[PDB]
Structure 1
Amino acid sequence: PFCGGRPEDGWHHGSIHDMDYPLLGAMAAICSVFIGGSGAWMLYRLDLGLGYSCKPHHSGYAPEANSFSALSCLVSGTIYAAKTFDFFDGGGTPFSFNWYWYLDYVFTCPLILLDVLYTLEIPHKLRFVFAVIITLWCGVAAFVTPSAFRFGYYAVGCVWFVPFSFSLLRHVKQRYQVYPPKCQKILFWACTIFFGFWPLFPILFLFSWLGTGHIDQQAFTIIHAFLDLFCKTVFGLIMTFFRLELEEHTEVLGLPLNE
């Protein structure tokens, strides 16, 4: 996908790519080990057994759709390792997961969403996943367009995200009442990261260098790194503990859900 990165004299001072790459690479390395390591603990804990009491799994193995939290974190930790490699080489390298904004999210956010859809038994899974993929590609396109048609790609994703988010909130509110009081407490916090932090990504674009010019690319990277520590690892850990409490109630104690 690339045709031109770092110039031979280095980045020109005044470019959006003239950043502190040693600092950014350090932050990406911390994120890599944190997010990827959280996904590895998550995988380990899945295989340990069912709830908090670790009841042996029914088939002997973990359900396949219980792994999306772990996988999103393990894939994002790998993407952050690629990012540290680019930042430590000074930017603009042939394989850069830093260059195209939101491309890394095309591969990670569908998995975070699948985690919710499967854990909460949400209908219209295909419609929801397709929606999110469309939206993320509109963001990729908005960052790549050098004209005011970047606001057209931005608005097309908003036309896909506003319906998606309202439909999902409705569905998750319906499911919330089925859950036991202890699992509803964990879910509250997952819903505040999924529906409270997901809308911030679009607003940050509006204040960026491709918007009002308040947030530069270096600051945008730091903000997104912190947002990914919450929207990937904290989210996945909350979702793992929701499932452990769910299955401690439903599988280990055999009690029922409040339909």
Structure 2
Amino acid sequence: HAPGTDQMFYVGTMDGWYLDTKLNSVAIGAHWSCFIVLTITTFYLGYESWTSRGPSKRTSFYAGYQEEQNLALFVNFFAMLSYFGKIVADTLGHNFGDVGPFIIGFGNYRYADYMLTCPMLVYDLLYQLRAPYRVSCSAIIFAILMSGVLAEFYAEGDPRLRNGAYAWYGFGCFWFIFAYSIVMSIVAKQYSRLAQLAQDTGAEHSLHVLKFAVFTFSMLWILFPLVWAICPRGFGWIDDNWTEVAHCVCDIVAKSCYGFALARFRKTYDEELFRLLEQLGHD
């Protein structure tokens, strides 16, 4: 297994797959609650998607053609799946943390669940303001998430290779800072152009609601490096058992609040601001 040491590493193997769970009761309860709320948000958003009329309220299957409107749905849907298998683990009492086979887009690994969620989510949110460079942000966050997965892989491995985890941490943090700066800049410029093009709208309160939602949604990603630093992978100011509840509340804020905000926006928007958004998505 390892040279010079009789200890063996169970990460990425079926041997660690059959090990008993290292979680406690509160982690299982948090997983259950997160799965329940993800499922009910997915059901509610799908119910709204089935009864989703167009802006003119006469087009029947508007979501059937403008399928990107349902895009967040899929992400939220996958989030439910991203936890459902863990619930199965919570049923069986066996180890599930970074063990077993590696499959893209599943919650069997800590950061690999975000492969199909995070780039689509950021693409959808910047598409809602018709911001340019749609593919670029998704590619950047995909690369950062892959770096995070590989850093977590080095974290559990041989302690002689512990130094690479900090290097990949620095890599991911540098690209995340760059991505956050560029997305904040483009969002600020785009919404400034929208505001200077927002004359005689009649939805100023709705405009305030949407600007508050998008600014909070842009600034929410400050959780990831703080959470990584406070867990034992970084400075270790918290223990492992309280990391799972943190990840649950963070990705609930990321997904369910996003779905609720989009649902509340779609029941209050009007058509002239819509056509001004299409006008904005030109230059």
TM-score with structure 1 setting the length: 0.82
In structure 2, relative to structure 1, the CA distance for the partners of 1:176 and 1:47 (3 Å cut) is farther
Pair 1:238 & 2:261 matched = yes
Q: CA deviation at 1:73?
A: 1.1
Pair 1:36 & 2:59 matched = no
For residue 76 of structure 2, what is the aligned residue in structure 1? 73
For residue 205 of structure 1, what is the aligned residue in structure 2? 228
Pair 1:124 & 2:133 matched = yes
Q: Is the 8 A contact 2:206 2:268 kept in 1?
A: yes
Q: Is the 8 A contact 1:69 1:236 kept in 2?
A: yes
Q: Is the 8 A contact 2:123 2:135 kept in 1?
A: no
Pair 1:55 & 2:57 matched = yes
SS at match of 2:219: coil
1:207-256 CA-to-partner distances (Å, cap 9, x unmatched) read 2111122222221110010111111001221123224433x2438xx874
Q: Is the 8 A contact 1:117 1:125 kept in 2?
A: yes
Q: Spell out the pairing of 1:62-101 with structure 2 (5 A cutoff).
A: 62-93=65-96, 94=100, 100-101=109-110
1:88-117 CA-to-partner distances (Å, cap 9, x unmatched) read 322425469555211112222122112212
Segments of structure 2 that go 5 or more residues without pairing to the other structure are: 1-10, 156-161
For residue 173 of structure 1, what is the aligned residue in structure 2? 188
In structure 2, relative to structure 1, the CA distance for the partners of 1:25 and 1:224 (3 Å cut) is same
Deviates more, 1:216-225 or 1:41-50: 41-50
Kindly, what percent of the aligned residue pairs are identical? 21
In structure 2, relative to structure 1, the CA distance for the partners of 1:106 and 1:100 (3 Å cut) is same
SS at match of 2:115: helix
- Paired with 1:114 and 1:57, the residues of 2 have a C-alpha distance of 25
Q: C-alpha root-mean-square deviation of aligned residues, in Å?
A: 2.8
> Which residue among 175, 197, 211 is the counterpart of 1:160?
175
For residue 248 of structure 2, what is the aligned residue in structure 1? 225
- Specify the code of the residue in structure 2 equivalent to 1:238: A
1:111-139 CA-to-partner distances (Å, cap 9, x unmatched) read 21122122121211111100010111111
Q: Spell out the pairing of 1:241-252 with structure 2 (5 A cutoff).
A: 241-246=264-269, 248-250=270-272
Provide the aligned length of Structure 1 versus Structure 2.
247
Deviates more, 1:207-216 or 1:176-185: 176-185
Segments of structure 1 that go 5 or more residues without pairing to the other structure are: 12-17
SS at match of 2:241: helix
SS at match of 2:168: helix
In structure 2, relative to structure 1, the CA distance for the partners of 1:208 and 1:105 (3 Å cut) is same
Select the structure with the greater relative contact order (CA < 8 A; seq sep ≥ 6).
1
- Paired with 2:56 and 2:87, the residues of 1 have a C-alpha distance of 37
TM-score with structure 2 setting the length: 0.76
Q: Is the 8 A contact 2:35 2:83 kept in 1?
A: yes
For residue 152 of structure 2, what is the aligned residue in structure 1? 143
> Which residue among 189, 212, 216 is the counterpart of 2:239?
216
Q: Is the 8 A contact 1:35 1:73 kept in 2?
A: yes
In structure 2, relative to structure 1, the CA distance for the partners of 1:47 and 1:54 (3 Å cut) is farther
